Amino acid sequence: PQVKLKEGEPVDVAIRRFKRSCEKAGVLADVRKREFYEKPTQERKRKKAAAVKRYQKKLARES
Amino acid sequence: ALTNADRAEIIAKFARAENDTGSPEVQVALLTAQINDLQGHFKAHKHDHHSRRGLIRMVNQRRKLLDYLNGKDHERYTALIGALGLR
Amino acid sequence: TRTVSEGVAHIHASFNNTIVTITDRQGNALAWATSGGQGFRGSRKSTPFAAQVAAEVAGKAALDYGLKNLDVLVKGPGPGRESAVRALGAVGYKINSITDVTPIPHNGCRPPKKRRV
Amino acid sequence: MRHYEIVLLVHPDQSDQVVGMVERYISQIKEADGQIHRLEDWGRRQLAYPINKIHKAHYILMNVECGQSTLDELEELFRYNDAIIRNLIIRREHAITEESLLAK
Amino acid sequence: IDYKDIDTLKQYITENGKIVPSRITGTKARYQRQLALAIKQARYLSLIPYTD
RNA sequence: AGUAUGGGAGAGGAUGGUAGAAUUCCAGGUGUAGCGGUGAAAUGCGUAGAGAUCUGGAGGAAUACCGAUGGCGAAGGCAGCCAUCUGGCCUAAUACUGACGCUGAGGUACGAAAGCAUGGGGAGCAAACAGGAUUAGAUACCCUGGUAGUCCAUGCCGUAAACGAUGUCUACUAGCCGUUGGGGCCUUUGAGGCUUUAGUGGCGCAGCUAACGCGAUAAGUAGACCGCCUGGGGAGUACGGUC
Ligand SMILES: [Mg+2]
Ligand SMILES: [Mg+2]
Ligand SMILES: [Mg+2]
Ligand SMILES: [Mg+2]
Ligand SMILES: [Mg+2]
Ligand SMILES: [Mg+2]
Ligand SMILES: [Mg+2]
Ligand SMILES: [Mg+2]
Ligand SMILES: [Mg+2]
Ligand SMILES: [Mg+2]
Ligand SMILES: [Mg+2]
Ligand SMILES: [Mg+2]
């Protein structure tokens, strides 16, 4: 955040910069997650799947 | 709590040979010292179930060592139990 | 009556609705408007077009007090975050900065249950 | 006995008292026996966030070799004192005595 | 890694004030654990901010 | 198999304290209309003035980022920071006792969540329950409220797809690639490369298997002790007994 505007900065470029800053921050993902409750078993399963996928990606890259 | 000094005193008192640390008597004396020490803590914290397993392990080890000593030598076992007032 | 040199814009963006509030620094609200306030009764309340229209109508009222420099705080995940800022730029206000203010709990209260449908 | 590190914040208004404050505390430790290894005055500093509607505070660091009862007394005195705003007690193995960063 | 050396700690905080994962920095796990502990202590001592 | 002496890692356990983020409620300042929610609506909340915004308080519960085929624990399971009490594990070298061991019928200890007894607490969520919807019907799915419960202290209960669907202990049998905690060696421009241990993962020869697959963390080759099964229902139910 805190995207200050230059003297001649067009509004569109500032909007794009704010979009990029928000995307880098990742706040939207947390806000989406907070909507509903994830039970411990479901989150453990999701993390296991994510780890397996990451390891597969690393092995594919190394090849 | 028991410091290195107390342990050294116990070992010296029950040592049989010079530099002896592994004889049954020394091990039983050290275990008895620790078991007696832990009584105050377990009186203070009665729901610490995780450390009572270690306490029970010490008790079982003492029982095994005493049974071994009795089988090896009866007089030594009697003297050890008399000194420690165990049973 | 009051003359305010600089102002702040608040965007309560939601899936259902988008609310625009205009305030002056140190607090106090000068004017406000929402999608449902000017038509858009129903699902259109969520459309970004309603968001930009609401922002424009709010800005038009805000001009009455007299101000030329604005700051934007976007607080919500709803569609209309870009629409409101575009409208505020179009109406002629100078935006000093645009920031995000959406809250985040550090494991606070339990969120509601998931919707099975 | 045990080596502790104590970093404590005090209010600017009572700043003139700090010179006395530390002194008395040291005396109490020296009453039992103790040892005072480090004592650094970082000075007034702006806070990263307002503590009790206060934007600046004076930080002071101490390193001691004290007993349990003295530590408890120090904790109680810190808590009941109104001048100081928040303290931190960290047990340290061995004593560190050298020019500490952020000294000046 | 101690709470005192605020500069090194700042060399790993993010603009929002969050800790950066080891995957980006490339640091060792033990170093990361002490790094996070020092950040939390300094954050408690109002030397670095909790958030932005 | 065990003991003494130096070090190291860790959400292991018990007690107390304390920090920041957020939700709800309360009081106040600006301000005037709606807000909220759904696929769409409606119930509901609001001109004794809501929603939005700012300030100051109350209370309960849980610890974003770090966070990871990561860590610790016998299993159940353990996540902010600080102190006290305390269990186990890894690692180096010496010095000790000298088979002191393994398993284990009965027995005994601990044991998720739900539920029970007494006394507290109650933010959020939420069985039952009351309304609004959809439908042919709606005892549900969806929406608005909401009680027990979820939290604490002292006890009881002893059950889970309590799962790796794989009892414990011991010796041996190609290799390759990761990662966590240590030991040793070789370079150096201060971080890398090799080995050795104890964990934790992905492939894979021989061997085994009905097949799928397992494969030094065996479901391979052997030994010691225990538990269990004998077609599908009836039934983990009837009678007796213990709790
Ligand atoms: Mg056994
Ligand atoms: Mg049995
Ligand atoms: Mg019981
Ligand atoms: Mg409901
Ligand atoms: Mg308790
Ligand atoms: Mg069963
Ligand atoms: Mg389980
Ligand atoms: Mg399983
Ligand atoms: Mg089974
Ligand atoms: Mg086998
Ligand atoms: Mg039959
Ligand atoms: Mg029965």
Coil, strand or helix: which one is C68? Answer: coil
Amino acid symbol at D13: D
Alpha carbon distance C21, C55 (integer Å): 9
Listed in order, strand segments (DSSP E) in chain B are none
From the CA of C113, the nearest ligand is: 4
Six-digit token pair at B1? 């709590």
Q: Total structural domains in chain E?
A: 1
Which range marks the domain in which residue C37 is found? 1-117
Question: D48–E48: do the CB atoms touch at under 8 Å?
Answer: yes
Distance CA D7, CA A48 (A): 42
> For E4, which residue in chain D has the nearest alpha carbon?
D101
Q: Which nucleotide is nearest to E13 (CA to C1')?
A: F65
Tokens linked to B71? 């089988």
Using the Cβ of A13 and the Cβ atoms of chain C, whether some distance falls under 8 Å is answered with: no
- Most C CBs within 10 A among A5, A6, A24, A38, hence the mutation to make, goes to A5
* Domain enclosing residue E6, as ranges: 1-52
> Are the CB atoms for D90 and D14 separated by under 8 Å?
no
**Cα B4 to ligand 7 centroid, rounded to whole Å:** 42
Contact C59, C26 (CB under 8 A): no
Hunting for tokens 């001009």 — which residue is that? C63
The DSSP symbol for E13 reads: B
Nearest nucleotide to A62 (CA to C1') is F177
Which residues in chain E are contacts of D59 at CB distance < 8 A? 45
> Closest by alpha carbon to C40, among C55, C53, C27, C30?
C53
Q: Which chains touch C (3 or more CB pairs under 8 A)?
A: A
Cβ distance C89 to A16 under 8 Å? no
CB C22 within 8 A of CB C30: yes
The resolution of the experimental structure, rounded to one decimal in Å, is 2.7
Give D-chain residues touching E46 at CB under 8 angstroms.
9, 47-49, 51, 57, 86
CB contact (8 A) between residue A4 and residue C97: yes
DSSP 8-state symbol, A39: P
Beta-carbon separation of C86 and A15 below 8 A: yes
Q: Six-digit token pair at A31?
A: 């806000």
- What determination technique applies here? cryo-EM
Q: Does C102 touch chain A (CB under 8 A)?
A: yes
Considering CB atoms only, which of A2, A12, A37 is closest to C110? A37
Distance CA B81, CA A31 (A): 69
User: What is the C-alpha to C-alpha distance for residues C14 and C54, in angstroms, rounded to an integer?
Assistant: 14
